[PDB]
Amino acid sequence: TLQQQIIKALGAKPQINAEEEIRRSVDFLKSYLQTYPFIKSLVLGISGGQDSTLAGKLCQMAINELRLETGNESLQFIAVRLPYGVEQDCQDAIAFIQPDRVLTVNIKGAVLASEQALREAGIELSDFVRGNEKARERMKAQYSIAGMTSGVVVGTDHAAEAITGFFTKYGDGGTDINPLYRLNKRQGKQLLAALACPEHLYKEVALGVTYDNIDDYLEGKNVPQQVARTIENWYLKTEHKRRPPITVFDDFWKK
């Protein structure tokens, strides 16, 4: 079935062991850094939300262990705050993660400058497109930081986000390494609980579909037809976001 097909593609499991998944992600990050020694930093945008809070904690753990085990003091986890103009949740998240370094880059100026350039070209952006434009400016800032600190950009994408394609293409979807990929929303909460994360940091989505509906679907459970159809629709519609640019050799799009 299509549901079983999606579950397999995203690597989702019905249930997981929190401790095991935490270690899987941490050792994944550690192993990558050990394989490419020229990498000295992990860069991640912090928003105060569940996903980035979890990913941030895992990145700092990976760095903490590597520094102790290798004695390499040049390794660092860099948390980046990317506000659009003008924090409590972000501040609480930062206190929980305890990142080596915190940078704050206000993206408003660049976004306004981009729109002025487009306006002079005769193009006026809608609030909707502006939202994706902001996500791409955030991607730009993180890659510029990575470029100057010999780092890689960590992403927060996971199964509950990938299934609907609810991320900006080459925006927050533009990252180098995604340690949360495979986990659904509630499973992310499970890991945060095991990490003793402040409860208020992790506790609808669209067309009457909630995260519980999405997680149940990903866990192989039976959900209402209306819900299942909406989910599967979003998935098929956004396949282009989960693959590299389309070439004459691809056939996944042919109907």
Ligand X SMILES: NC(=O)c1ccc[n+]([C@@H]2O[C@H](COP(=O)([O-])OP(=O)(O)OC[C@H]3O[C@@H](n4cnc5c(N)ncnc54)[C@H](O)[C@@H]3O)[C@@H](O)[C@H]2O)c1
Positions marked active-site = 51, 161
Pick one of 18, 166, 186, 212: the residue that binds ligand X (CB under 6 A).
166
Question: Does the annotation list 150 as a binding residue?
Answer: no
Rounded least distance, CB 209 to ligand X, Å:
9
Told to check if 130 binds ligand X by CB under 6 A, we report no
Closest distance of CB 168 from ligand X, Å: 4
The three-point CA angle 249-173-55 to 5° equals: 130
Interface with ligand X (CB under 6 A), residue from 206, 221, 226, 229: 206
124: Cβ contacts below 8 Å, ≥ 6 apart: 118
Q: How far apart are CA 102 and CA 80, in angstroms?
A: 6
Kindly list the distances between the CA atom of residue 182 and the CA atoms of 53, 57, 77, 227, in Å, as whole numbers in the listed order.
Answer: 17, 17, 23, 21
Query: What is the C-alpha R_g of the chain?
Result: 19
Q: In degrees to the nearest 10, what's the CA dihedral of 127, 133, 232, 12? A: -130
- In the complex, minimum distance from the CB of residue 67 to ligand X, in angstroms, rounded to a whole number: 36
Contact criterion met (CB below 8 Å) for 168 and 140: no
Closer CB to ligand X, 97 or 153, in the complex: 153
Contact map string, positions 8 to 47, toward ligand X, x by CB under 6 A: ----------------------------------------
Nearer to ligand X, 42 or 227 (CB): 227
CB atoms under 10 Å from CB of 97, counted, come to: 25
Q: Using CB under 6 A, which of 13, 67, 240, 242 touches ligand X?
A: 240
The smaller minimum CB distance to ligand X, of residues 62 and 180, is found at 180
Does 127 appear as a known binding residue?
no
Q: Does 169 belong to an annotated binding site?
A: yes
The single residue among 132, 143, 186, 212 that binds ligand X, judged by CB under 6 A, is: 132
46 is in an annotated binding site: yes
Q: Distance from CA of residue 45 to its chain's centroid?
A: 9
* Pairing mode of beta strands 41-46, 101-104: unpaired
H-run or E-run covering 192: helix 185-194
Residue 182 assigned to a binding site: no
The least CB distance from residue 118 to ligand X, in Å, is 14
How far apart are the C-alpha atoms of 150 and 50, rounded to whole Å? 27
Q: State which residue, 109 or 131, has the beta carbon closest to ligand X.
A: 131
The answer to the question of residue 242 lying near ligand X (CB under 6 A) is no
Give the residues lining the site for ligand X (CB under 6 A). Answer: 131-132, 166-169, 206, 240
Which parts are annotated binding residues for ATP? Answer: 45-52, 81, 156, 185
